[PDB]
Amino acid sequence: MEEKELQASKNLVTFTPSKDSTKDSFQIATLICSTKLTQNVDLLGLLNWRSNSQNIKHNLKKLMEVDGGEIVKFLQDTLDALFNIMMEMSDSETYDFLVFDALVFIISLIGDIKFQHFNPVLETYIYKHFSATLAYVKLSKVLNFYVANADDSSKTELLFAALKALKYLFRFIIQSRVLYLRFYGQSKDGDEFNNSIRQLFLAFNMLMDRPLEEAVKIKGAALKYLPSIINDVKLVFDPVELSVLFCKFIQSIPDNQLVRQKLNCMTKIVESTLFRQSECREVLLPLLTDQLSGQLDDN
């Protein structure tokens, strides 16, 4: 009623409530430990952005600060909402940035214990209900933009969080890619796609060449999470080229920094995709020897 008076204040349209709104009051606490009920303005705006084609900018801003418990109720539905949004409002690639940020928030949120069991749901989504075709193009686009623009402090933590999410980000990239491929039968531009891969990775290399102080944390985070993607790369790429990429990446490191970090990195590599051995073992190997032999005797 008070907010009615507020709208009645601006809209004096026969707004004279009866006094039977008397002095007496009551107080009630409402808790809802449900499984589908949801209380969030931003979330519902996401659910009728089709009728809120304006505040999508606004919502996007407000999304990353929404409670994850509310969100995980309809994570997949919101994923689809987002995907439709970015298919449709593909015009504002700035909105695509906001999308990128929000979805990073999503998956990072998922990384917490509270939500871990929902990981299958995500892939239950991914392989079964993901329905975006050129999304991966925009994804690689935004990502390479970001890695290029690493000099920003305000994008620095964003890059960090992205590094925290590489597996799933990459997997959605793959899914949009291959979705495009099949729904077009084949890939009229797979070349530039693998390029995008290469220049993205090159941007990583020049990060390694950048001052560590910017992202020492984040450069370690890189060497941590980068090898995660490689096994999905296998599905969509030449392992040999991937291999030489990661090699040159290793040289991209100045030789007195985060030793054990890079060690654990190459551990994560030899872990997997070394299995497709003969075309990758021989070429990854030498570098590993060179560094361990440096690691052998240095005092």
Structure in words:
This protein has 16 helices and no strands. 67% of the residues lie in helices and 0% in strands. By secondary structure, the protein is mainly α. Belongs to the DOCK family. This is Dedicator of cytokinesis protein 5.
Secondary structure topology:
Layout: H1 2-10, H2 41-47, H3 56-63, H4 68-72, H5 75-88, H6 93-111, H7 119-129, H8 135-148, H9 153-163, H10 166-183, H11 190-209, H12 212-225, H13 230-236, H14 239-251, H15 259-271, H16 281-296
Strand content: under 5%
End-to-end distance: 77 Å
Please give the share of residues in helix.
55-70%
State the total count of DSSP E strands. Answer: 0
Modified residues (N6-acetyllysine): 224
Family: Belongs to the DOCK family.
Function: Guanine nucleotide exchange factor (GEF) for Rho and Rac. GEF proteins activate small GTPases by exchanging bound GDP for free GTP. Along with DOCK1, mediates CRK/CRKL regulation of epithelial and endothelial cell spreading and migration on type IV collagen.
Subunit structure: Interacts with CRK and CRKL. Interacts (via N-terminus) with tensin TNS3 (via N-terminus); the interaction increases DOCK5 guanine nucleotide exchange activity towards Rac. Interacts with ELMO1.
